[model samples]
Target: SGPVPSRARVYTDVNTHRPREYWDYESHVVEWGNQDDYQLVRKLGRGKYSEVFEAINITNNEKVVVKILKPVKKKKIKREIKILENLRGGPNIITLADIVKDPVSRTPALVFEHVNNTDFKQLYQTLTDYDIRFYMYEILKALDYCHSMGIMHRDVKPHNVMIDHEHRKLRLIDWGLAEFYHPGQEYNVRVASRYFKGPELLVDYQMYDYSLDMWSLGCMLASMIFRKEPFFHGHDNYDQLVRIAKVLGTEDLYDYIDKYNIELDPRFNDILGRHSRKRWERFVHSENQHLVSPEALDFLDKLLRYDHQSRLTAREAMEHPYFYTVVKDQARMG
Candidate 1:
């Protein structure tokens, strides 16, 4: 890879072109461990890629998450393992302690540091203005670290953010959909959950950059601050974009596509209609007003932009005025 053509609208490009070892996922050597070393404790959850379980490391009695991957292309599994290894020491990244396989079934499993997470529907209700600011800042550190390493977390939603409310610990888990970035690379638009998808994915825009995660982060923040389960409630894939248009305005979305010379898919002709950009304040209500603030509103506005490049970079977002409250807390005596 030579160089990515300069795009004026793209976010600050820092170390966009790095060595293959830093960005390449092609040749990943996986080391398998003894499956008997760990015993299943309980079923924790599941994902499109794996059956998740809370397990005990028999040697130490330490709890860890065992993600028994569903059948997938070998390349996909290798890519994930390589990424976890690459991001091992980064801030709040899920640690890949080991990789094991089921002896009988010959199935592979990923062992990771476990974080106790509170369900979003249940957790969002209890967060105060300060709590949201602190957690949002914590997530920015993880995002900034990954982007600095030339990786893009294609999927970033509340469900992937694990929180230990009592200890105020946070971990960004589930790097399954995450990918390393190479300039001018065409990425699969089918990634990310529908509600959290960036406009780039919705419009089938390839060559998308790291800003996709920012858009997903914006969607998560909107839901938390607005008291809406899903800020964009799309019944289906196409419907997701339409749902966004209802709030972000359909006109600006078209302009974005035009600026980048993106051809609007024909299906959009029927699903999209006239819309005006709705104000963020319109979402404030008695239930959610406590968590709403001028800085939070400004941060949300900066993140939910239709143009991925226009959204704030994770590093820039970490310094935004919205996190002033968090900074103040850091200043006080501890």
Candidate 2:
């Protein structure tokens, strides 16, 4: 009730001691005396759609993360809960332990096991080569499992991969954009952050598959390994395409476009012209070569390839030499 620790300082020795019998720990019970009961202590973060708080569950006296959504339609909230429930027990996937409704505000709250360590972005800054490789591999494995279960986590960024201080495991969070695919069902046209979005999404703006997730995975790996954002930094969409063409020549896109029977947008031709593939190869190879192994590079090449259908499947990618040699070692120690 006095001063809540910032995430960074939460573990510092000076702030480590918690008075075992604090009132807030016991009195602030969630509604209904639910087994997933938690004592809301302080605000952790707030986003456009939801607010997160540091909470302690009374039943186990364990810390957990509680996400409270702003008033929304019931069906939408239910869908989100369904997605979260479908992904429980995954090593790399965050587990949704409980759901409750605030008695006073009437807001819906989702409870999750608390993760103490930083997200992958923050961790990437401090980790060595081995750490990066191992963490990335685990992330891939998690995705593979999700795909097998017919789920697509549209958001796959460093911010979503959380680290647990106690177990030192990487946990994926935030499934607001996840969806279950059924053949013949109309695909959702928009999903995922723009920077990590796949070429098919960028070009056709059509309903797509899990490959979009792989694209995000590539972006995350590149950013972590190279210590820089790999995609366009321009202010507008057209400029973004220009930046993409600057790195990957137009020729590369041509092959992919032909293979997929995708029509190139006229707006892109002015800046990208005909040599986008060459540009991309030179830029990535020259700048980020040192960040990944040859095996990883080979797989990344395919992942970034223009032909979405030709892209490597999650299962196939997991079997790549990079995962076996570079990533496996990192996981063993982590």
Candidate 3:
């Protein structure tokens, strides 16, 4: 199930089935000479798509993070490369330095600037209120920039947010699930991690937009302040909704069903019926009281709105009262 290449055997046979016009001969070539270009120091992390290795560029002794994708689906690998190419150099985004093809395994690897600080999840557990607020501001700024470019980072989580403690910077990484918005594309239905999934995604709404990112951000913010998971840890989707209903309450839960014009299969309604607003409101108020400041709570409220259209846009969120009240003066004084 994992994306990492397990076997040591190198595939030598050319994919003769592919047409000459469609095959990219250059993509298949492995440059073993460049193996010494960087010293593979250690493994940073591994995901379903690739294995991240901490390495040092031998020439300049500069450190970098290299993501080596297992030789599997060629199209998926190319898509990730294309997305990273487009999102190369924003301060809040990760910097992609180069793409290397492994000679032995015929795999493609992505090289990026090595980030050392802990991610937002770990940072949340250790930092003070001031630090949390500051990091949150940086994340919002990154999201603002991404939304402006019409890029939707479908996967937004604490792990994806790397905190550079030395520089006090928050870098958003892992754009593998990112989608480019174009006119006439009704909706982007591909859902990301379940914990950060938006209501529309749960409801299977088609015409969703960048607001989904905001929903994930809201969840991240909550987790940051609470130091606990935001949603229920359901073993399955049915149990997941049950957890949501427990926190969100049941009054008007289905209110947005028709408003969003979603086609709710009977299974959805049968499991979680209409009146879920009470549970949701109670969950918000209780969670708000325990974890977040009033300003942050206000922004979270808007971001988590059931009506996706009413949810705050990243640009609008920049002007959010939370940022203004919490970090504005700090920035001015600094």
Candidate 4:
């Protein structure tokens, strides 16, 4: 809003370096696969935009995911397809196998490689500290790859992370809300889920960049270590900021709002009473002491900053001491 316009600290011109055709989804032509090729085995789940099912690809009788889109604008459908196409095979990014459509109703569906994922609720319960560190590193690799390629996965919550604990594999799925980052571009702040929403979104600062995803990851990590399910228990979009303010404190919240020259939602005037910042150690107790370590707390402190620009980039986060064992062992052997 002033001379302090923000940009991603790293990979700022990634999109700028690419061909316009690569980033332009509106003009990309759609090639639809035959809807008859896959048979739905069962209903997996439903999102606001789509219904998911476990399907069998008749060609090979292999398992796959078929996400049937609701009647939304073609522009959105193309955007998701284009981003997936661009990000295919990068780190743990989900594999977009094919695009199918119903000829009669003109419905669209996205086919993806199936991952046997246990729900995070159950999965996180049995995760050891090493398990969390290893998987968090894996997801960071996906985030770093996408950010390097100029994409932001607007959704980074536990639900979007598919973990095959048997194989210790993680895939960052759901590119529907992802958007290409352009420096100084004012994007829609209403992107991530409520509990995972960043301070910039709650404050309505729309010129946010890749750091937004890091904040979401931080929320996910916080929940994992503290066993809180959702570390920030916000009731709605309005209270989301209040919940974060309760932990990060209203003092830094004011500083953040002032730094970005943001006009916070007027509704906050009544509900947001002053709160001092909470120490990360305060979250530790007998119940979660095993998962709580100094390095874990330090890593979280870097991630959950009020200043988006100050948060660790995905690449930088992978190098944090919390992941020292995960990173060093691989580096030494390679």
Candidate 5:
């Protein structure tokens, strides 16, 4: 019928309730895949929840990814599978090829489509100002699609973004932290990684919506144009908001927590202080000035809002002037 609205935030997705069946995860039946069908070849990446490897689907002779999950509650494992299955045809959403479990140990594994991705840390340095816009717009499509489909990709760090520059292909991977949005529901504030965690999470506001992903996307896009690996480099969970406040300013941070009547963790009492919002131009150097434009700064300002309600949603972000290159080239790409 409609996109779920956060109990606390003003933002809501487009397809809040077009159909519950489309967004429902737990209701789906999971077909346990035969572990013998796939062979792990080599490691691709590792994360808190799983060890990812490039694998071969022996029967099809095609390369796939086998994510051998770490020991976790069965509830969490099933959640990832259910979410993946629900997002089967969404743009850039990782495909769940199969699900398997070890016969002896009963350890579960998930098979996904393989994406040839270069580490963004190295790859970001090579992109042109225009190239950055193209990629970010591609990422926006993934964000908007998921938001419309009633999913929140809580973890939207560069690590989860797969880019094959040669082919100019992008895929949003890792749905372990993704969840179906429900109106008036309180979510875990401890979900996203420290650098990309939204102000709502830092302030312990549990009732966040799809706009949380917009904040994480802002963190990545800010880095793309600023040449910073992590725009907000927080030292610890406690300091994450302070890092944001230092740049985005403390006044709004205070206003936001006050708006929602969110309690501040006493640990940050001394760390939080008045910081007038710094202009994006300060980050401009000979290295990054070309990428930093008036419109780009405006786009970032909208994305990195202290209030989740104020942040621009993914669909709005795609229409910003920063994506001019993307719009102009859409026809050629098609």
Candidate 6:
């Protein structure tokens, strides 16, 4: 009645074409694997919902990752398991080796193929331009494959993407927040982390699609080349939009709001101010000049559009000329 309903430009009926069983995680029974087959080596990190560790698979004497889910709803655990299973063979998708549970606390843990990852903060600082292009292209492959299969990885950040720079391996991990794309379905806008939240999310636009991941990926690329840990440094969720608008500009924001017929939050009335779009070149500096190029700026412009529909899809991004060096290098290797 108010705003027109929007649909994904591509892969709109993916869930409709598949059987109900494919998307039904609630009914799926967990076949608990043997936890005795693996032994924890060291604590890697502790996340809000899980504890990650390096582990040894005694069954094959190989390294693996053990992700133990802290007490969470059964539905959440099921969703993660089901999504991983669905994305099993996709290119650059994280491999789930097995699912195990502690009988005493009933804690669920997922075993994954190990990745020798250097922390992104230190690692990204040292990457050559070609290294960034190759890895970004690898990530796009994962994004493209997941979107083609009707899944949106709600969380797409440097943290979630494990890169083994030595071996040139990258795996898109953490499908915990991922969901199957069903046309016209209203998804939770509170999905992605603050730094990576797209314009649609901040504005409470819930009818988003896989393009949401594209926006997050753009944020990743921006942070990488700009040498900003988070390209959009927002103090909070509201300020997040401000950070984007300050650079992307306020006038274009109004146009986007008008196109979507989105009602801005009443709270922004006080803090939001008029802003002129800053030139992308303004962000280029001596430190990061080596990473910037005509093609790189053009690619960033395409991906960071305020209109989600206008942003480059992962498949389209893969073909961007910014990745020409990667394409040429691959051919040379082949």
Q: State which candidate has the highest lDDT.
A: 4
**Model 2 global lDDT (CA atoms, 0 to 1):** 0.66
Better of 1 and 3 by TM-score: 1
Deviation in Å, model 4, residue 95 alpha carbon:
0.4
TM-score of 2: 0.79
lDDT per model vs. reference: 0.84, 0.66, 0.66, 0.92, 0.83, 0.90
Q: List the residue pairs that clash in candidate 1.
A: none
Query: Where does candidate 6 stray beyond 4 Å?
Result: 332-334
Ranking by lDDT: 4, 6, 1, 5, 3, 2
lDDT of 4 by residue, 80-197 (tens): 9999999998999999999999999899999999999977667867999988999999999999999999999999999899999998889999999999999999999889999999
Residues 1-334 of candidate 6: C-alpha lDDT, one tens digit per residue: 4555678898888878888878888988889899899999999999889999999999889999999999988898998898899899899999999999988878889999999987776686789888889999999999999898889999998889988888889999989899989889998999888999999999888899999999999999998888887899899999999999999999888898899888887878567698999999999999998988889889999999899899998988999899987888787643
Provide backbone clash counts, one per model: 0, 11, 15, 0, 6, 0
RMSD of each: 3.1, 13.2, 9.8, 1.6, 3.5, 1.5
lDDT of model 3 at position 217? 86
User: Which segments of candidate 3 are over 4 A away from where they belong?
Assistant: 1-35, 103-105, 119-122, 186-188, 249-252, 274-291, 325-334
Give me the displacement of residue 41 in model 5, in angstroms: 0.9
Candidate 5 CA-lDDT value: 0.83
Candidate with the larger TM-score of 2 and 5: 5
In Å, residue 154's CA in model 2 sits off its true spot by 0.8
Q: What TM-score does prediction 1 earn?
A: 0.92
lDDT for each residue of candidate 2 in 124-211, tens digit (9 for 90 to 100): 4567656666777788888877776566788887668786533657888888877664433345646666666666666654546667
For the record, the alpha-carbon RMSD of candidate 4 to the native fold, in angstroms, is: 1.6
Segments of candidate 4 deviating more than 4 angstroms: 1-4, 331-334
* Residue-wise C-alpha lDDT for candidate 1, range 1-334, written one tens digit per residue: 3213323243334435556565456765667988998999899877767899999999999999999999898788888888889889898888999999877888999999877777665676688888888999999999989877767888898888899887888999888888877666678988988999998888888778788999999998998888786899999988999999999998899888777777776878688888999999999998889999999999999999997778998888989999987977777775
